[PDB]
Design a protein around this ligand. Structure first.
Ligand SMILES: Nc1ncnc2c1ncn2[C@@H]1O[C@@H](COP(=O)(O)OP(=O)(O)OP(=O)(O)OP(=O)(O)OC[C@@H]2O[C@@H](n3cnc4c(N)ncnc43)[C@H](O)[C@H]2O)[C@H](O)[C@H]1O
Ligand SMILES: Nc1ncnc2c1ncn2[C@@H]1O[C@@H](COP(=O)(O)OP(=O)(O)OP(=O)(O)OP(=O)(O)OC[C@@H]2O[C@@H](n3cnc4c(N)ncnc43)[C@H](O)[C@H]2O)[C@H](O)[C@H]1O
Lengths: 530, 530
């Protein structure tokens, strides 16, 4: 439960992000990231690089965004990559039928005049929205007589709208192209050279961290629905008969909420199972999928996503992506409800075969005399933007004070900068201490910034808390004149303080940020300071 | 003088980069970067972040690539951002008139039948190619009767071709847009919030590191001419009356080749002046421009660009970009001749005014009672791709041996990974040493990789040299069985070796890579090893 309004005001005021081309009216689905937004975004990307690429020794490549039409036609995007769209016969307003129908039912379930039986009927309908096809969705639009949310007009029947941006490569219109809606294709077209890196053996994973474009019909979810974003995609090529991951046992003991396809059709809630158990019973197909689901859980959690607002939902029969057979999405509970922030599909051998057949170029591998096989690929897809937004709503808090101050309980690994060093005076009296502390923090690899802003220490930290700085060190006169020279350490979340010699604080902060020590531990060793 | 052919073969074989969508015929102007290509590209970006953003405390932002037409129409790109194009009346082959005329004259100057007087005439023409306008270029195409390079056909008159990619944002064609040809605009539309970070005082700089698109007419220069690339742009906002940079004296003593507009019109060669002297005489307008020209020189140099193949060329009167008044480009001598890899324009107050007037939104600042002013901006534009390519041609070498091996003398700060650790056996006998060395190197922040490839040590390093690994440590039996336990250190460029205790090598390599010690110094302290 978060006050989106108040938050968007803080994120825009401190400039995490904001409307792109604001002075022109702004384009929906487009936003720019300010200084703190980039710092946070970079921390999230770097953390991701460590968690996956570095942890699994994934091969990295950087493919182009521009894509010639033939490529996307083969992958099947030109035909299936789209959302159903509607528009009132009056003017040309377009809406994503998928979501309009959802906002309409929620409207009816909110009206007190709604009976219990109908409320239930509608709930069952929403829990199957991603299944309904061209026709099924057309009927519901009639049964509920759905009409334009603005000055209720009559909506035309739901039709498919390809989400890919169109363009022309080079002069003339002989080579029409698109902006890649995902990165996966780039890795597939370079399968041979990539497979070659691993001696030609399976399994192995390739990844990409770049921009993708989706000409979203009607973006109205802030950063949740942009037409341009950064995504990290991992393509894990494995033997279709060796779909077993050697490291699964590393996450087999995690307890996370799973919402299987069955539980969705049988109308029951999601369960909090143990990964290992989930695979045993058959809920989660194999262990390769199970490993990544665990690593994903760990990543999102480490970055700041709340376990109580995180779950993995499996796709339904006809919800499947045109390229997948099985899939699980990491959805986060937000002010916009449950939304996927990480897609993890098991798109068998769809891709490699399509390109192989179309280009007349074989894309396979061998196994022991020797047999050739088309690697099944599990694709963990990360929408960094959505992941960051979720972090905002899950760590945004209002201080218990009339002044209505706000702060983000950002984990030390993602916060703009771990420590904030703020002295009272700037005279050559404090510099000797500020300089030393700063450099000391630098030797400990602790990002920091010397606060100069005007106002009382309390007001100084107020700004620090707004952008989620994890810790702060106050350097007052008792630090310069008294001896031993001690400074004040402040915990962002609790606002509680500590007093210790300014030469020891560096290592203390380091351990606090690296999770080697608890704020509790700190209060146990050093004297409290109010 | 480099054998482009042989090089492109090594860059593509080891997978630094290669044709994008290769299995489809490949699209010109598009390439993908493989593992080593990304490692190198990332090192170049990181080095750039340290050199500029971190060194000048530049504010970073990340704007969108999609841009609504009105924005680019105001900036003047919709009208002036283009290259002159020609095409043979026969088929529809398009060519950049600018470059075709250049390739034609070079052809005539190469034929022995060419007289000295005409050769001179043509040289004077090429040294003014970027000045010739719509008409002047049309006449030359007649005087020299330029015809299609392929099966000589008759070329149509030179016409302007807007280099911007076209697209439509959202459903329908009511909001036509483009892909940003540069990033600068993004910073300008966010001038108010950016100026706000600096208390509203000048000067201050904002920067962006992202992708830009240029629908290049006929790309045929490898990575030199792509339709999609990564660029780092710095927008340095300064008081039009305070165009003086406080740090200029930090680079005032650099000797670099300058090729002023005069020297280009007066038909004389470029001079190797001292930055300070250059500003004195008035060659380089102010010191703000002089500082950046120095920092740029230092950056390119540190990354691997050869000083003897680097120069800064000033634009001519009508060569000016539609948004600039003065400018200097860092051009590198390559197999494609001199090409700009860094643009440094002094586009006064063109931008801020244009957007202010069009949006009816003021974009100014104040100065001491107080006067408002439109900040003059100096834009150092970096084409990371071109900078990396230049590094390739300037560090690519062929070993003096029949086998024709190749290697890149990459500076330690940009090489894929600084040290290569390669043992003879993998048995539990060597592991204790390999493990220790590896971790030790990690504690010293020295990137490395344990070589496993088969073949003799000499053949092992052959692969290491190909991707430019700076150093190598050989761990043989005399390392495991003998005592003290010593290993062999190998310099990539010289291939000369050294023998020292395996516990001291970590710090030795660190200093060698961080430029704290010379390979000469090493051979002076430790015993040589053949
Ligand atoms: N019968 C049917 N036929 C065809 N389609 C059917 C269908 N039934 C249901 N559908 C669904 O309709 C499509 C709607 O797509 P979208 O328009 O992208 O809406 P979405 O469901 O919120 O994102 P999506 O699910 O596509 O993200 P993805 O896995 O591609 O990639 C991974 C995601 O990328 C990121 N991401 C996606 N869109 C983003 C955006 N606009 N902004 C920021 N991040 C985004 C997310 O963080 C990450 O989870 C779904 O792809 C498809 O499953
Ligand atoms: N009268 C006139 N009217 C209009 N135009 C006239 C003119 N007389 C001459 N011209 C010239 O014609 C245009 C041709 O442009 P381009 O088509 O980009 O060719 P260029 O000169 O090699 O690059 P450019 O000079 O544009 O790079 P820029 O400063 O924008 O940005 C910085 C560069 O970005 C990078 N970069 C640019 N293009 C790249 C590419 N295709 N691939 C990779 N990197 C690229 C480079 O590394 C970096 O130096 C020049 O912009 C303009 O000066």
């Amino acid at each position: 439960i978060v006050d989106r309004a108040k938050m968007e005001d803080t994120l825009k005021r401190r400039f995490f992000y904001d409307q792109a081309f604001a002075i022109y009216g702004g384009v929906s689905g487009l936003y720019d990231f300010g200084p703190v937004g980039c710092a946070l975004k970079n921390n999230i990307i770097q953390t991701w690089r460590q968690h996956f690429i570095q942890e699994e020794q994934i091969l990295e490549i950087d493919c182009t965004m521009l894509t010639p039409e033939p490529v996307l036609k083969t992958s099947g995007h030109v035909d299936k990559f789209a959302d159903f769209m509607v528009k009132d016969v009056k003017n040309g307003e377009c809406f994503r039928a998928d979501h309009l129908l959802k906002a309409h039912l929620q409207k009816l379930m909110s009206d007190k005049k709604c009976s219990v039986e109908k409320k239930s009927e509608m709930e069952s309908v929403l829990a199957q929205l991603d299944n309904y096809g061209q026709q099924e969705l057309a009927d519901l639009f009639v049964n509920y007589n759905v009409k334009s949310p603005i000055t209720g007009n009559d909506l035309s029947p739901p039709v498919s709208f390809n989400l890919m941006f169109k363009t022309f490569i080079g002069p003339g219109g002989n080579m029409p192209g698109y902006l890649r809606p995902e990165t996966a294709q780039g890795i597939f077209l370079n399968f041979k050279r990539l497979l070659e890196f691993n001696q030609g053996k399976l399994p192995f994973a390739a990844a990409q961290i770049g921009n993708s474009f989706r000409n979203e019909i009607s973006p109205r979810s802030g950063l949740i629905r942009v037409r341009e974003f950064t995504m990290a995609e991992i393509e894990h090529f494995v033997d279709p008969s060796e779909k077993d991951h050697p490291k699964f046992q590393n996450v087999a003991d995690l307890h996370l909420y799973l919402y299987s396809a069955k539980a969705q059709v049988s109308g029951q809630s999601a369960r909090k199972m143990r990964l290992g158990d989930a695979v045993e019973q058959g809920v989660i197909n194999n262990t390769v999928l199970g490993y990544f689901i665990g690593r994903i859980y760990l990543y999102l959690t480490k970055v700041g996503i709340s376990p109580d607002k995180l779950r993995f939902r499996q796709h339904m029969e006809n919800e499947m992506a045109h390229y997948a057979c099985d899939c699980w999405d990491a959805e986060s509970k937000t002010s916009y409800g449950w939304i996927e922030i990480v897609g993890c599909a098991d798109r068998s051998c769809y891709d490699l075969s399509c390109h192989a057949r179309a280009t007349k170029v074989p894309l396979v591998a061998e196994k022991p005399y020797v047999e050739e096989v088309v690697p099944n690929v599990i694709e963990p897809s990360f929408g960094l933007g959505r992941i960051m937004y979720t972090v905002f709503e899950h760590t945004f808090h209002v201080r218990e004070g009339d002044e209505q101050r706000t702060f983000f309980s950002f984990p030390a690994v993602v916060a703009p900068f771990k420590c904030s060093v703020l002295p009272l005076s700037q005279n050559q009296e404090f510099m000797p201490f500020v300089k030393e502390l700063s450099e000391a923090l630098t030797r400990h690899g602790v990002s920091h910034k010397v606060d100069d802003s005007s106002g009382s220490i309390g007001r100084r930290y107020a700004r620090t808390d707004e952008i989620g700085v994890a810790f702060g060190v106050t350097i007052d006169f008792d630090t310069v004149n008294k001896t031993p020279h001690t400074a004040t350490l402040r915990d962002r979340d609790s606002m509680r303080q500590i007093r210790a010699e300014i030469s020891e604080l560096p290592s203390i902060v380091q351990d606090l940020a690296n999770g080697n020590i608890t704020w509790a531990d700190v209060e146990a060793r050093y004297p409290l300071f109010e």
